[PDB]
Amino acid sequence: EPLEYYRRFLKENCRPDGRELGEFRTTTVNIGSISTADGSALVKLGNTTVICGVKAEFAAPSTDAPDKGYVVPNVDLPPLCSSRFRSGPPGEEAQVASQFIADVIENSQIIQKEDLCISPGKLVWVLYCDLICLDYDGNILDACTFALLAALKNVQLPEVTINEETALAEVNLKKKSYLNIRTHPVATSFAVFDDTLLIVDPTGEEEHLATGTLTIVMDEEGKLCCLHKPGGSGLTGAKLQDCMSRAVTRHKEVKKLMDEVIKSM
Amino acid sequence: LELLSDQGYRVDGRRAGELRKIQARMGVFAQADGSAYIEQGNTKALAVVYGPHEIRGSRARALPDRALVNCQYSSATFSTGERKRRPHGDRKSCEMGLQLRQTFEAAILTQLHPRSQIDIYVQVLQADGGTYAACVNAATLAVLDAGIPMRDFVCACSAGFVDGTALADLSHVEEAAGGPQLALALLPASGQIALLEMDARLHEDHLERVLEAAAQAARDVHTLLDRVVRQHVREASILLG
Amino acid sequence: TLSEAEKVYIVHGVQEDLRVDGRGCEDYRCVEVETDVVSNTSGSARVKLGHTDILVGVKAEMGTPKLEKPNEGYLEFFVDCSASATPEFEGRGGDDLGTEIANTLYRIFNNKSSVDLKTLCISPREHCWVLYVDVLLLECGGNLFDAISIAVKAALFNTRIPRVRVLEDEEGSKDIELSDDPYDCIRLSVENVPCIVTLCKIGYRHVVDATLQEEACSLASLLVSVTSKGVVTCMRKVGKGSLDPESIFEMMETGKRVGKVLHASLQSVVHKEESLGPKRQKVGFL
Amino acid sequence: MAMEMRLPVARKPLSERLGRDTKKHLVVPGDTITTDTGFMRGHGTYMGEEKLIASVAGSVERVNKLICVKALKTRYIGEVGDIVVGRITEVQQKRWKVETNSRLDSVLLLSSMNLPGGELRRRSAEDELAMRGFLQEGDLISAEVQAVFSDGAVSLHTRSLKYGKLGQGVLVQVSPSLVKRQKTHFHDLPCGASVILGNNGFIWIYPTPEHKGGFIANLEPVSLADREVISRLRNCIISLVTQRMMLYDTSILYCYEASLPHQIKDILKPEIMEEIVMETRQRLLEQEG
Amino acid sequence: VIEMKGRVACEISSADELLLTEMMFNGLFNDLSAEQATALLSCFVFQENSSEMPKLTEQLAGPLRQMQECAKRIAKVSAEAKLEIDEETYLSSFKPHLMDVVYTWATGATFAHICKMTDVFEGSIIRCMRRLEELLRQMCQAAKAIGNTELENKFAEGITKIKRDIVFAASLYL
Amino acid sequence: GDHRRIRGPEESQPPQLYAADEEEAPGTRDPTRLRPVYARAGLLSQAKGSAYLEAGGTKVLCAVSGPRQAPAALRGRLLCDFRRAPFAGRRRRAPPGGCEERELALALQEALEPAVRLGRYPRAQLEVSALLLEDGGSALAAALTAAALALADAGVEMYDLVVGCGLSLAPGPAPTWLLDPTRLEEERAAAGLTVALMPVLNQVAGLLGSGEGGLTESWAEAVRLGLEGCQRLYPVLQQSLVRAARRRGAAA
Amino acid sequence: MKETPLSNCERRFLLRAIEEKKRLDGRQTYDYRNIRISFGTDYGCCIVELGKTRVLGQVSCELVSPKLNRATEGILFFNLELSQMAAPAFEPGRQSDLLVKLNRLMERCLRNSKCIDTESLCVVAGEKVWQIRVDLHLLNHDGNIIDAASIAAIVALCHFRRPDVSVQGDEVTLYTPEERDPVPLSIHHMPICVSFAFFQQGTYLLVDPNEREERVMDGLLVIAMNKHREICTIQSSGGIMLLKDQVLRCSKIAGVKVAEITELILKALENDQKVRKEGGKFGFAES
Amino acid sequence: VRYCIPGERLCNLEEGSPGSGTYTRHGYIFSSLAGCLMKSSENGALPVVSVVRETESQLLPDVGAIVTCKVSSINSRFAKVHILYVGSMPLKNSFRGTIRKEDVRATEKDKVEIYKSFRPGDIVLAKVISLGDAQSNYLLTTAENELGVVVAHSESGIQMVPISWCEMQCPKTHTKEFRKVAR
């Protein structure tokens, strides 16, 4: 009798865990936990958990845009996250999340691909940002985006040079250089029950028994990078402006958190 | 290099109407229910037939009327000089499987082994031209060694067309030249073809020639195979008593 | 598979130092070795150990060397576990055992002292040799790994790579010069290429060439890789069962002795055959 | 210890060492058996265009008016009284599914298997649950056929207590066309053991007891003097079959008596195999006639 | 040890099986029709004498001559082993006195059009026909054993021809 | 091109291979030394049992998706999926793998089947999923230990725990067996080895090895050394499990 | 899902109507169905529908590094997909046999017959060459595919146009369809398959069989031909025993059939060019 | 109180006997789980040691039970269900039970009809009889008038009220569905 048990709390303006329908759960990060990787970031929202490792490599660009350093995300929902996933190739949710992360990276323009070209037409960086879920208690997109941004700030790259005599490039793993990122896109999630009831940061069950879901990415300068609205019972702008406000608030909060962290190092 | 000297000879040193000495054997592997080996020149096919046995994981495919033929093809990596990988699962070995399957389902006379797998397996160790026919013939010898009823030796071979003439039992050289090559497999007793593959461009009036030539080559292959089989049966019976 | 009482019979037999084939616990069976079976390869070999028949092809191709090791070439291994062995293999069910065997064969040759790869280098970072080994299974009657190893060694011994001079030229033009002397082809040493040895434990006694019926009766099996000198390249353990710490040592000592004997016999046989010549007629599958 | 390697020697075909020139009528598919007024067909042939055409490789046999073929390798077709040895493969709610060298999965119905002692009343669910704890998956049964179904399968039973489940012993798998169709497949030899010769290709070899139905497992040791004999018999049978000759009491007894000089292991080496088989064959042939 | 003929005869218990199997393996039923076989089997099940031996047409008598030849062969082979057997009796222990009766019955006729052709009671005819149907089941199984199919379908068709109204009625006690 | 992942570049080589330097060598140390270990069971929530182990730069997770319906034939099963995260190691590898992941998976299965008792888990398959977040030395041993912890945590029955230990060989003139090494001591090495045992009943469960060289006596000393290391490591894991059980008692 | 089983009624009725030489819709045995060739807006798209069987064909290009064995001539990449809208049974990765045989047959037919000029489409011998792929998609499945797939591939590869390119030394310059006029391909001869279906072991033969006729047939003879009477491929499938005269007669049929189909195709291309030369992004031809 | 571990010994056979979650080796017992041990004592003075992971300690729905369940699948023969509440203590280990045709009412009439007694997606409570052997298929029965369906949703989304023995109705609109109403 799950749904009924849940409507009782919903109408008491609460949830069975102790959250007031509009607040998230304990959000925490950990930077630089990993040496083998250029950038590393652990994120966890109470029970939900995500980890991003960003490696850096060389590669030859395309012919349409030689001055473009690729940024390739891939999300991994291994079977140890939840039992709804099975050992094998990637399912559907992983792939959807991957395309979401890529759309974000491409639209928010947090990073200029041009800032990754060493020798146009010949070399350019490729940033393989690999995200891994470890507890899919719910709201995996927020965690994925936040971990991506955190690690992608942690990343400091080496410096390379070109020798015309050898016609090859050399690296200097001693000196390095951080990675400039302009926008700080944060993602805020929503679960829409029958008609008008929007809860924020929905956990697992709340997403299992929901009529629809929503996600909204809100850049710092009062703009949006993505309004992910896969199906749902419907919405009018009045049930949407409020979500945008709450998204701005969450942006503020998590950016303050991330600043405190990068400064506590 | 050349294919038909003006005299009539080939490279290997054989006229158009003849072929290379097949050297075969029946009874290679004893842990099976039927086995064979054949070298139709440099080629070296190897067949195996795990007999009509039970279906496991029934998966609702056990035909109740007739038997279930499952033939698998394989061309070893070191077969050709150019090494290749993924000999199984490719889009060509599976076509060969279909071909062998629709041949032997025609010949193998399945109406007597209903709800049973006849598992045919073919591995090609060396390929120098005529790679399908060697396999057909090896699987035939195998079937026979496994006492599986079958209408007739389903004998196969290949023909080709060069300088307005028909060649029998091509090799890799004239198979690489790009000329028309027509492979087939027929049942001699009735004169009926069980399979007819063909791949290259040529006129129509030049069809009957290569067709009858391949047929006659298959008849010769029939003679050789049946002599082998008769030696085998005779020796076995003599040893029995 | 098989029953329980047969397992009792076999284990008490071993404990008594007899076996259904009336042989002890340190006795292989007649292994029919042959070499130069297939012709299109730069090397080949075949083994028939009881009821397991293995074929091995070896192709010496030209390829780019490995960036971390441009000064020398490399061996690659592929393993076709043809369904002709047991029908329970197909395009997907034999990949498991094939992968296992290939990973072993690699682990035997991350040794740097087995095949002198420096002898396989033409021009560092520019061209090199590559030994594509291709194992082909045709029966499974146990003691699989030892036979595969013996075949690998017989194939290497029977490998004949041609000499090539790769001459550079400006404006990016490269030329290869052959030596028109198929009799003047080089030969790589195998005085270190190791043989595998599979000691399966039955009851409280260890056994070599563990026939299937006895593998099903066992709980552990130690794979050793020995060279003719006495060293132990690899030491792996396989089995859904446990294994004591002391028996390991006996297994290792026995593997050492058996490797000595095995390598001696193989070396003698293959020198014999190389002596004979084309007079042997290369009886294979006939 | 002792290890030995050796190159492969080429066969010596034609079995000229015998020199028989058989008086049989061999055939192969496509071959046309005698076409006459109303000749009935049997296993190993078919009809086409008013012509009796073989289907399998072997010798033809013309009983008074029936034309059949007797192939040299097949899988055990089910007769109605033939004894049989079988390895179990499955345990279905109603019965057991057994594996013989047959073209399907032989069947032993729960109604057939004898009960501990003679406690015969009827079969109930309690028996349906002991259906497993007694006859484990993978065990062996020495039965005799009960009947053959139209789908080809063989339903088999256990007439008496001489049949049922088997002890520890040892087993061999040969072709079923290498055991002479005769009586008393159950032999108890003077050598110190006993043997069961299936009408299929499954031979069982067990030490002979002293008391004289498998409901208890005598998982006791076996004297060396009764395992060496079993192993020698096993290797002798393998020899016989490797040379393609029939198999029954006198054959195995005489190969045994032949393989005493040659030790218990050196009688698989093809030379020893061949000489033993030749000795046995010659002495059978000359003594019998 | 047994031979195929034995595994074909064992299926038969309702009559003389040696002679039936010889009739098979000499090719008699492979040329006749559905009913003629029923008649040649009536020649065996029936064992009573009647006043007037009937007159039979060639199409239906001829086969009985081949039957008697096989019987004579069996009789000689029995006499060779000295079974103290006689030939005339063994041969004449098979009464064809109901062949025409059974033929007309299988043509789908009326029991009243049948009880007249012969100066024999009815219950004896009923026993004859029931034993005949049993023997037909047995012969179907024998043909099923050797491997033939036309012959077993033939015998099954004969059975389907016999059972119409009263020869196979219910037992009031049932 | 893979159509289940994002379109990246065809090929991509790392920058290190384009570096120019002689990497730093460790030098000397106490051969019979062990790294500081942090082992905790009960980390993950959505899993019946989970465990986490850190030893130096080594960082490994393991989860146990419990019994999932799927005598000697009605005997349990456990299928193990080892998997190193693409952001571990100097080089990057696509997630799939297919060369060494499966070898180490076979190792885990061969080392766990003995300890676990599967007669009490019939008609069932336990999905063990290991994950290697960072490689810093002995990896397969950490994975064995973590899978053992995760199983013992989910409450599957056993006979004893599994303790692993990795060893390497110093290529110096006086080669000594180096215990519980680092990725540097392991890439600059001649031979490597891995033991795994059940210390109560003193029985190996799965071992493995390889060598640029060696010899019987050396391998034997290596074996006994790894056994001693595993013995000295066992108590940590004991205390970790006790601690997790206490936390469970606290929750209710 | 699964295909609905076939009733014995329909089977017997079909076999009898064949015995009596009567098709269902009302056509003879040596006749195709009205084939329509419709074009799209983008050069290289064609929807060809014969009766109820619709098949789509798209042709695309790329520039890529060639393969060493042939560093002069380019590449060509076929692919046929059986969309689930064709029929229920066509789940992804299940009806693989049909895919394999069709794709191998089509590759063989077009590639090895040398229908197009893989040489003309070279730009830099060793570095950059063209790469023409053709994706056929099966939309409705009523009977004969190979014929439809082939007609589609041919109409496409004859109704396709490359972005022109200029070259000097190694300097390669690609251009847009708006800067220059794309250049067509180079065909030598247009082959199109022809499908015969055998009934009763070989006694009867039909052309352009429907779906039911494909379910109650035992054998299938595919024959590729040109307007110049040049066999390109012939294949027998279904495990059937035919003879010589049968294939000879089938070939003498395929001759006329291919001549007519070719006339139609050419008319279609002519009409499409006329339309685009007058305002209009379509082109339509009817049998 | 002491938490144990899958390898440590606990006691001689002379000082206890294995109850559960343990095993035996030479003259000793050895645990098999990470959990809390307990040695119960009979009037016989010989203790029974056992080990438990009290997370999900143990439950057992016995014959004379009253267990709720949810109707998932149905047929003209039987209706299958999932076990949620054994009494009143839920159990995340949802067991799977069955309800037969005749074992539906105390009257045992064959006239009963599933589709007029049950529907997929409603909660009932019943009494188990057979545990099951292979798949532990619980067989539940409702041969009583205070048994069966208690809550049942309407055609689309409304919860109905148990008017009578075999009738139920939705309060908003009017429509008489048929079930095996409880009580």
Tab-separated table of C-alpha atoms in Angstrom, chain D residues 174-182 185 197-203 245-248:
chain	number	residue	atom	x	y	z
D	174	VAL	CA	32.038	-48.089	-27.524
D	175	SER	CA	29.936	-48.275	-30.633
D	176	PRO	CA	26.763	-50.378	-30.343
D	177	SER	CA	27.530	-52.236	-33.585
D	178	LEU	CA	30.458	-53.999	-31.893
D	179	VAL	CA	28.658	-56.270	-29.421
D	180	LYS	CA	27.319	-59.546	-30.759
D	181	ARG	CA	23.565	-59.867	-30.302
D	182	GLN	CA	23.368	-62.892	-28.027
D	185	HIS	CA	25.132	-59.977	-21.381
D	197	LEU	CA	27.690	-55.679	-22.209
D	198	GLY	CA	24.932	-53.328	-23.272
D	199	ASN	CA	23.023	-53.812	-26.472
D	200	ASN	CA	24.063	-50.179	-26.691
D	201	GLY	CA	27.721	-49.232	-26.583
D	202	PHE	CA	28.002	-48.885	-22.815
D	203	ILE	CA	30.057	-51.589	-21.125
D	245	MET	CA	36.198	-56.499	-34.110
D	246	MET	CA	33.201	-57.874	-32.241
D	247	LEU	CA	33.082	-58.094	-28.468
D	248	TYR	CA	31.871	-60.821	-26.116
